[PDB]
Symmetry: C5
Subunit: 366 residues, 5 copies
């Protein structure tokens, strides 16, 4: 219809991008922020320079997630506009390269866990890296990283097969359903590119997480599981659940469709006479966006994945105007980003074509 | 029954937790602060990351005590609620793992005393670690640290046996009763897990400390003893005495029952028409909480250990309201912590089941 | 023939310098800034001291360009006034020497690209160095850098020869037309000095960049090209185009004469009743000098190259007055430089004799 | 007169401590500052941690003097109260240990003079260390550092024996009478402890310094002497003279008694209707406490040594109130110390029993 | 005797010091600043400590000149008052030692020129060091540095003999006439001390700088010369010229007497009804003391060297009062030093006995 005060385009416009085979003008301006200025734009160089993240005060531990969410958005841009597919592929190439720099993964070694960030555990880093390898090849058709993708995929597969519980831990003795969801999605992508059936393990993982790691009544996952002590931390998490449901919807749509209504009841607050919405991070509080501060932003991605245009509009009306977007020299900027990973996640939500459609992305024109 | 101004829960409610088999909501919110947010909560990871302490400005020398006092509080959480015992055990695993990081023990080397922090002396560090080894095993039933526990317990026992005075020194030539008190309690915990009689050394230690290291009429220990010169520092200390009497009460309850009312006469100032109290750190002053600033907070622990609900309420009415507690997103914060180790010591005193009860904690049956 | 506030000499006087065989007094005052004060002037010593650049807050990635644009201006100074030819030669010797300091090229290593900055790729650096080598020898008698010049020229020639596309990438997988224009110009200088035909490769390059790297109708180059993915970034760039058209005019005057009118219509905004002009950096914006902020400054150099006295006057009337020039002790300073590389590019544009003229520099004495 | 605002006890009270065999409450409060709080009190640990000096902004070159002046005061505390003698001995042990930390002597190496701070010259460090070895043993009777004390005493005496002038230098070619006085005093302490006669060299030194190095009419020493060039710097120094006469008074009382009245006439300004005094650092100025800023504080020590209760009272009335003392949790603090080494030198002057008395200290137990 | 507001002594008084055999009280207070306070005075120690310069914010590249200009001043102090000659000699000993510290010469290595600061070129450092060696021995009669002096003098001689132009460069391919003047003056001093004729190379050097490097009508040298390109930088420089003419006056007084009036016409602006003067650094400007900001300060030295009392008084009336000199505890301080090397150059100019007089300095005996 029409756009609220501090909004750049309507929700109708974002949802129509694929049908119209073109990104909106503000999505183009975000692509310009990512690509345009020498040395300081985030996708300027495959080198290990991180000036763009320094300029944004990205904490070191968060750089790997920023790169990953940029990559996931780029993959949908490729699906939206055939004429931007080469550009998206080039940016994905750079994302894989930067992801492998020690600035990005070195917290593993500084925390004392080892010098090799892919060898075992650390799925929080290598789950994303493996998915990125795969999306890069889907987009470009390039075998640049094929040997690396095969090696990391088998490593992930072997870890899963050898655990008594379904899945893999991130750090030693810490298990997170959201990092597992990335890892399993990368198996689906590998199976798409090659003959394989790495995805066969997904069934046992979906059955396992619905047992003790989820509150089926509230449609919400608990914070984390700890296999050695058997502990499940007793708080439910909105950002955890929105992220997980979104990726799971790409592999088993019925699963996410079952819990999504109950999820909204549990965490989502509609206000401003139906015009806006904000998301509580855990139960037993009125406060929105507590904890890591990302409940609302990940629910925006979930709403987009589930095709919920109403909730999408309500969340973006809450999230974007107070941040004060402007476009300068055809480039997107925010004066007051409201959270970590802010331009990254709003970019992803505006373009996201569904993790299922990424799995079914047609071959490049060659 | 009435909630005093500025307080989160009644003293009646804290003391009733174990009987009702549930922590209070503000204790649960302290557990949330300890466990909830990725990367920056203190018990997120077993790696050598200390962001949580950095954000609270904890002095390096104080981190070992922070971790230890959290661990003692978690052991009581395990007794209070069977459903939180797995989480308490997980947190204790992380505590032991963090305790061994060089950030925690490295002052020993930097001061020029040696490269190995458990080898000889340095009881202030290895006393707490040995007790944490034993508490972890009592909570979880896990033998993960058992070889390390055996090794350190024998080091402690051997050192005691070799010394012509009863006990062990901290720094070379510096002897503190409170650090010894931790070391001996760890001997009792070892004997409880195994068949042993290591605790037999306790009687000679208790004889020695009542001879020149205490003023028996004031129920107060002197600051320190220095074996080589024979010197005893001629100032008495409240935080020293409160800590020591609380731990000793778990090994020889009659000892502590004897001195406790004298200690209160010597140091405790009741004010505001009996509603509040604060604790003087040494004799011959009117000033409260001088020196390291922890007389009141350790006396809060001692009041809990001794079953003194009247003094517990008075001290907590003095300590907590001016720190401005609030619960945001189901997690506890203080705007103005009044001392070092503030959330640690309030957490520990609110849940503390008594050191005797910890020593005799039943197995995780069900 | 009149002078607005903040201008130091007329556009007529700048364009007449060569015919008068004398620099303007403000150009002499700029040469004083470059040469006068012990230790802190930029051309005081061949050593690796960069105090002059620290005092101007030059980012280290930009120092190589600062040095190169000084060098290109000095070459025209040698052509303008024979009495300053020896000084200009001395300054060029120092430029080459400083250009080889690790402070200048070391970003290549820190980004992780290698320890040798001329081995392969890195044309953004070694292209400028190779041109500097040649201009030095044209201006002076000297064969000081002759072996280095021959060696690098070969490296560039071989790298062009082995590439499937016309030209050379900067960093890996990143192709920029403006950095290539520098490299190709250096081949023409080498041929001029010796008997060679390295320049024969120019035709293919010019045919190639006119295919997909340029919008023919708008007279504007796209930001960059990336051979591995085949991507051309979809934004056109003014500073890119102005710099490239300026250098190509020295090799194929017809090439640049074809696109110049369209370039001006695309990017240049005339304002203040025809007295001023400023340049938009890309399409679809009204903002001037976005991006790296050098569209106007490089268009100033292009106007000089193309002999466009009206546009030159308009651009200098926009750029110089707000920067507040002053001449103190016969040395030029600016209170408010409006961009990076500010005194470097205004110096170059004021003296620039034309890149074709520099190729045709009459030989020095014996 | 009455006890003025920023004073803590009367001068009569400080001078009567030893008769009464008890320190005053504010002296006890200073010992509490020195000993009480974990990790950050100066005498908490024999380790090479210097957090107490970091908190006071002590320049590194000054830490060696801080530790030594503490040690000289601790020695008198042992003489004053037999019940604090074991504490004083413990603090002296820690003082010797910290004194040997590279944080303390490392300037010798950084300045480029060599890696070993005791083998030659550098009397400014090793003179104090040697005197502290000896005071520790007089206080405790412990033989812990006896071999080191024997080693360093022989080094120092050999150096004296080999020089054409009487004494030793600090830096190469810089000779200071105050650093020499410390070295010679430590020879007397060694003789008191053992059978020896190292002090026999004192007469040639006292003879020598009464020639070129002192202005006998003004009762004041010149800044320094430099043997290779023969140069004697032509300015007189009050802090130099006050420290030197205090220590020499313990070896040759007549020497200091001769020059003390001239010294006072030369440097001391009484003001505020006889209630206060402040000391000019050099001649030809009206300014008090110029130079290193320590004239008044060392003259406070010298007054105590000479038994001049009136000048001691006047100087302490000048020095202590503007520094704003208070006692908090039974520990002494100053909000605005007016010089380097401030709580150190006020501590020393309050307790100082006389260097001759220290020399004659009765065995412990 | 009439004395302007922020002046401490009259020009008549400065020019009379040698005949009266005594320095003025403000010159004595400057020596007090140089020598008095422990650790932080510049001439406290022969070690490689540079606290005095850190406190004054001296740029590292400038420290070699500060030490050198202090040394040249100390040499005149020795000639002025026999009673301060020992002190001046002691201070020169320290100057030579500190000069050899890596903090002083290390810019040579950092710029990438090499690890040995004396073997070739770098006359800007080693010419000063060589002159300092000689002045030390003239003042003291000590042969402490004689072998180093002989060695460096030979190095300089051989480098001159091997060059196709008259003289030596500083940095590679940078020739400066002022730095040459120091080096040639050092050959005269060596000749004075020993039997030799190193100075014979001087005539060819004066012939060369007069032919190519000075504008004889303006009595002013060009900024620099660059042998490999042949470039002479086309600006004339006042501080360059003043420094060079002062030192040349000691070797060929006729040379400097020829250009001095023309130099004053070119650069020196007399103002305030003839009471003051200030010096323009280059031609075609009205700005005073541009560039390195030292034109007036070096012209003050030159006026002293040439005996020009009137111009000396004018320049000091321009330079000293806005810096606000005062005397505190018998030591000289300025609130607002107006340039680099400020107290160094005003010191030097106040005492300077003439470079020829320094060469003829009688033995101490």
């Amino acid at each position: 219809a029409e756009l609220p005060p501090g909004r750049l385009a309507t929700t109708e416009d974002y949802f129509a991008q694929q049908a119209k085979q073109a990104v909106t003008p503000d999505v183009m301006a975000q692509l310009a922020y990512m690509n345009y200025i020498d040395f300081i734009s985030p996708f300027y160089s495959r080198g290990c320079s991180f000036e763009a993240w320094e300029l944004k005060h990205t904490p070191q531990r968060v750089i790997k997630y920023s790169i990953a969410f940029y990559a996931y958005g780029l993959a949908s841009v490729a699906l939206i506009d055939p004429k931007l597919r080469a550009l998206a592929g080039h940016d994905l190439d750079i994302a894989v390269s930067k992801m492998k720099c020690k600035r990005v993964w070195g917290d593993w070694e500084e925390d004392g866990f080892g010098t090799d960030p892919i060898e075992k555990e650390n799925i929080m880093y290598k789950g994303h890296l493996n998915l990125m390898y795969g999306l890069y090849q889907l987009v470009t058709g390039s075998r640049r990283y094929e040997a690396e993708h095969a090696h990391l995929t088998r490593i992930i597969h072997d870890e899963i097969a050898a655990n008594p519980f379904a899945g893999i831990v991130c750090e030693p003795d810490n298990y997170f359903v959201q990092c597992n969801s990335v890892a399993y999605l990368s198996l689906w992508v590998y199976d798409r590119l090659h003959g394989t059936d790495y995805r066969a393990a997904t069934r046992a993982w979906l059955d396992f997480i619905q047992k003790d790691l989820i509150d089926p009544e509230r449609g919400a996952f608990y914070l984390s599981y700890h296999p050695e002590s058997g502990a499940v931390k007793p708080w439910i998490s909105a950002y955890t659940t929105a992220w997980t449901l979104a990726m799971v919807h790409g592999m088993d749509p019925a699963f996410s469709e079952r819990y999504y209504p109950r999820f909204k009841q549990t965490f989502v607050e509609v206000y401003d006479e139906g015009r806006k919405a904000r998301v509580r991070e855990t139960a037993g509080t009125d406060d929105a966006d507590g904890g890591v501060g990302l409940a609302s932003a990940f629910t925006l991605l979930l709403a987009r994945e589930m095709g919920d245009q109403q909730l999408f509009d309500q969340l973006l009306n809450h999230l974007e105007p107070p941040a004060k977007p402007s476009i300068v020299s055809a480039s997107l900027r925010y004066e007051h980003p409201g959270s970590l990973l802010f331009d990254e996640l709003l970019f992803l939500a505006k373009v996201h074509a569904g993790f299922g459609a990424l799995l079914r992305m047609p071959p490049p024109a060659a």
